[PDB]
Amino acid sequence: MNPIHDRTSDYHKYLKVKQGDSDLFKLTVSDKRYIWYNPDPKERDSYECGEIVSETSDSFTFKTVDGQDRQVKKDDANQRNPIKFDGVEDMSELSYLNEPAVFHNLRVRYNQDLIYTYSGLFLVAVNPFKRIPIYTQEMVDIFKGRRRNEVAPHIFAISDVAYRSMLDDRQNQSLLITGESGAGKTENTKKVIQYLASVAGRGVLEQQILQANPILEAFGNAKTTRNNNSSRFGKFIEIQFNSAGFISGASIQSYLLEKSRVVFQSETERNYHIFYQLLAGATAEEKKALHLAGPESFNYLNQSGCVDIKGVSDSEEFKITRQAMDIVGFSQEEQMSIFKIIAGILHLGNIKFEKGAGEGAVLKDKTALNAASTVFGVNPSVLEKALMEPRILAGRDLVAQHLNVEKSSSSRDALVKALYGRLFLWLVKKINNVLCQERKAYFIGVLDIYGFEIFKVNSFEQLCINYTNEKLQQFFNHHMFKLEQEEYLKEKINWTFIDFGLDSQATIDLIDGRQPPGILALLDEQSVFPNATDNTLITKLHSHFSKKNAKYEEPRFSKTEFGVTHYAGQVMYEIQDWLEKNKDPLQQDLELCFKDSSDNVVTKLFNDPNIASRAKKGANFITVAAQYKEQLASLMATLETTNPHFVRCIIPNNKQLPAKLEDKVVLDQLRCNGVLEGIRITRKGFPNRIIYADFVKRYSQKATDDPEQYRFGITKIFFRAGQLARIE
Numbered sequence: 001m002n003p004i005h006d007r008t009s010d011y012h013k014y015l016k017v018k019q020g021d022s023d024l025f026k027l028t029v030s031d032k033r034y035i036w037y038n039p040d041p042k043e044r045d046s047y048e049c050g051e052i053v054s055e056t057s058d059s060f061t062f063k064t065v066d067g068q069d070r071q072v073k074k075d076d077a078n079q080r081n082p083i084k085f086d087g088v089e090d091m092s093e094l095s096y097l098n099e100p101a102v103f104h105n106l107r108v109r110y111n112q113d114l115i116y117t118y119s120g121l122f123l124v125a126v127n128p129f130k131r132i133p134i135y136t137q138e139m140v141d142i143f144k145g146r147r148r149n150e151v152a153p154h155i156f157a158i159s160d161v162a163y164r165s166m167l168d169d170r171q172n173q174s175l176l177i178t179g180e181s182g183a184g185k186t187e188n189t190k191k192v193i194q195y196l197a198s199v200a201g202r203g204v205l206e207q208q209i210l211q212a213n214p215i216l217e218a219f220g221n222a223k224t225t226r227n228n229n230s231s232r233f234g235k236f237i238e239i240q241f242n243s244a245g246f247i248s249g250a251s252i253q254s255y256l257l258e259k260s261r262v263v264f265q266s267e268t269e270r271n272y273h274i275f276y277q278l279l280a281g282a283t284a285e286e287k288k289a290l291h292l293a294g295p296e297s298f299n300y301l302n303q304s305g306c307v308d309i310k311g312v313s314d315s316e317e318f319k320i321t322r323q324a325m326d327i328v329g330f331s332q333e334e335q336m337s338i339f340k341i342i343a344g345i346l347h348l349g350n351i352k353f354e355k356g357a358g359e360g361a362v363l364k365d366k367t368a369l370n371a372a373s374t375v376f377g378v379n380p381s382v383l384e385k386a387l388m389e390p391r392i393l394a395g396r397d398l399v400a401q402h403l404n405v406e407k408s409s410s411s412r413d414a415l416v417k418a419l420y421g422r423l424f425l426w427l428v429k430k431i432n433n434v435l436c437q438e439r440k441a442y443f444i445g446v447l448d449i450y451g452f453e454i455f456k457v458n459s460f461e462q463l464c465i466n467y468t469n470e471k472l473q474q475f476f477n478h479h480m481f482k483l484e485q486e487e488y489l490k491e492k493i494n495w496t497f498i499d500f501g502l503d504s505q506a507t508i509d510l511i512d513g514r515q516p517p518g519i520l521a522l523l524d525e526q527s528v529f530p531n532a533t534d535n536t537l538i539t540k541l542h543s544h545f546s547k548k549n550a551k552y553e554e555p556r557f558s559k560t561e562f563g564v565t566h567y568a569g570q571v572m573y574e575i576q577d578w579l580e581k582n583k584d585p586l587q588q589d590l591e592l593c594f595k596d597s598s599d600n601v602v603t604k605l606f607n608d609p610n611i612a613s614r615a616k617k618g619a620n621f622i623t624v625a626a627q628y629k630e631q632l633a634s635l636m637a638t639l640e641t642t643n644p645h646f647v648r649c650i651i652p653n654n655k656q657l658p659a660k661l662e663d664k665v666v667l668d669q670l671r672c673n674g675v676l677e678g679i680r681i682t683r684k685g686f687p688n689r690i691i692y693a694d695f696v697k698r699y700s701q702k703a704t705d706d707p708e709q710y711r712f713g714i715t716k717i718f719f720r721a722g723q724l725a726r727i728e
């Protein structure tokens with residue numbers, strides 16, 4: 001029996017709306033009409049259902065939950081849909097498209113663990129915060145080759161539509177998964193990869209593609225206050241296919257990892273998972289060979305007050321990480337080298353600098369220094385000198401500095417952040433060498449960026465993340481509304497322009513603009529000015545934007561913060577350390593020390609120019625900001641060469657709890673994502689069009705010729721959704 005028609009199947013049980021009863025049938029055939037209204041006009045996102053009891057030519061009168069009757073103009077009313085629509089799979093079918101109506105449909109589905117719903121052309125996914133059995137091999141097989149309208153909403157379905165569009169159109173595709181922090185982007189990405197690896201698979205390669213993930217999550221993910229498994233790097237995964245449509249390989253591009261987390265974490269957060277995995281899961285012999293102990297013994301692990309995550313065993317995860325490294329093909333010596341570096345970082349963090357006779361720092365106890373040097377394979381006298389007495393040029397003269405305690409500690413931190421960041425890039429490079437083995441014919445690119453985030457303290461890391469999220473929202477705006485309406489004009493189909501009111505360009509320009517200069521440009525200029533400080537930097541930003549740019553705020557309550565109004569809301573950024581973060585300095589004497597390491601992995605991190613070298617920009621090294629803007633611009637150029645498919649992940653609440661939809665939290669996301677606007681253009685517009693000549697040869701204007709479902713353009717014929725798909 002076909003699972004899609006069998007009401008006893010797990011497909012029906014977990015992906016279809018449950019059968020209503022006799023009492024529901026009664027309510028469903030009622031002739032009564034209802035409206036969504038706010039009991040408290042100050043709380044615009046809390047709605048109740050009232051019965052419409054009478055009407056005039058221009059008004060409705062309705063009963064409230066408590067009793068009393070209210071009036072409202074017909075043009076301001078948010079009418080409730082007939083309840084036969086509750087649970088509908090595609091919301092472009094609703095008679096009434098308004099905020100509480102769309103939220104209500106998502107709610108009915110979520111209450112019975114139906115997390116996926118279409119909104120016209122894109123998918124909406126609401127995080128369940130629990131396991132639902134809809135990703136087994138048996139589920140994969142059901143979606144295989146099925147068209148969107150033949151099956152229920154699912155991440156698998158949209159993945160298959162991209163795959164078929166790649167085969168039938170011979171063009172590259174992309175799956176763009178949006179969402180604020182913890183919304184479900186990474187979990188959904190994993191399912192897209194799973195599906196494509198199965199439906200287009202032949203083996204070992206497909207397993208290696210899958211086992212790349214645990215390695216990268218171990219080194220690249222950490223507990224933040226918004227997500228227990230937060231991705232602290234962005235990633236674009238290119239799944240590559242041959243001309244026949246079989247998987248031929250994969251390539252991973254990463255985006256700027258949060259190196260600062262290695263040396264500092266806020267209260268309740270954790271460092272990267274890998275540190276806890278090694279300390280919990282190391283063999284008693286490894287622990288002696290690496291001079292390890294428990295987390296509480298290390299400064300880099302004992303400052304947050306949190307060393308574990310509910311429902312996670314770090315010892316079990318370490319076993320998974322190691323099994324992944326084997327399948328991928330990291331040798332046993334390479335693995336030991338990797339953990340020697342992790343262990344050395346921890347030891348470096350334990351070095352305690354103290355004031356000496358004068359202002360220069362000294363090191364009284366050498367225990368931590370010696371254990372680090374042992375595992376890294378470097379000379380401890382050289383390391384010590386490089387940390388506290390690094391040599392620089394003054395003119396052309398060579399002068400030994402003697403750093404104070406604060407500067408010595410900061411330099412040790414820079415070493416640690418460089419070690420960890422370069423290791424991460426090396427891991428990605430090694431994975432890519434294994435997974436990518438053939439020139440591709442086509443690709444489906446899967447984008448999993450770090451999600452929009454706000455904390456008590458927001459720094460340069462959060463500005464880079466949030467800018468990226470704004471750029472991705474504008475790409476949605478561009479393809480859904482802007483490019484769409486421009487086609488209707490060029491083709492004179494008597495289309496009337498609509499302003500959908502979604503435009504992130506002003507904010508994007510405030511951040512990355514070149515003339516006049518934006519925030520990143522002024523940061524770069526200050527970064528190479530020898531007399532610049534964090535105070536001259538914030539003064540410059542206020543001078544250029546305060547009361548001049550509508551997306552900027554100089555706050556009256558602080559002298560070290562500035563505010564940017566993003567699509568997802570206003571964020572206040574603290575300027576402390578931005579110059580040093582943008583320059584990303586590392587004493588050369590530290591690099592010279594580690595170049596002489598006996599370890600074969602440590603030596604590649606400091607001698608491979610693709611990992612250890614930095615591009616020049618005239619007389620200065622390229623800034624972090626300039627490098628990042630360039631990487632992102634290149635991503636966006638690549639996406640513009642694909643046919644994009646969108647998944648909008650929505651977080652239900654801010655507590656990481658299941659079965660708890662919070663009205664204001666969800667509605668804020670639907671508004672700023674442009675979900676309703678996306679539905680309206682899908683209904684009022686003409687998604688399908690093809691040159692008349694190419695239409696006659698497959699399915700000129702006389703030849704080609706229900707009148708409503710098409711319109712004749714200057715060079716193409718335009719169909720609404722419903723017609724062009726239903727004639728082939």
Ligand SMILES: Nc1ncnc2c1ncn2[C@@H]1O[C@H](COP(=O)(O)OP(=O)(O)O)[C@@H](O)[C@H]1O
Binds near residue numbers: 130188
């Ligand atoms: N479809 C899902 N099924 C089960 N758990 C999910 C699902 N999607 C999100 N998660 C839960 O939410 C958490 C955070 O989601 P994640 O995809 O890591 O966020 P981001 O959007 O920041 O990558 C996951 O670790 C998991 O606990």
Ligand code: ALF
Binds near residue numbers: 185227
């Ligand atoms: F925590 Al995320 F994208 F992994 F916001």
Ligand SMILES: [Mg+2]
Binds near residue numbers: 186229
């Ligand atoms: Mg993630």
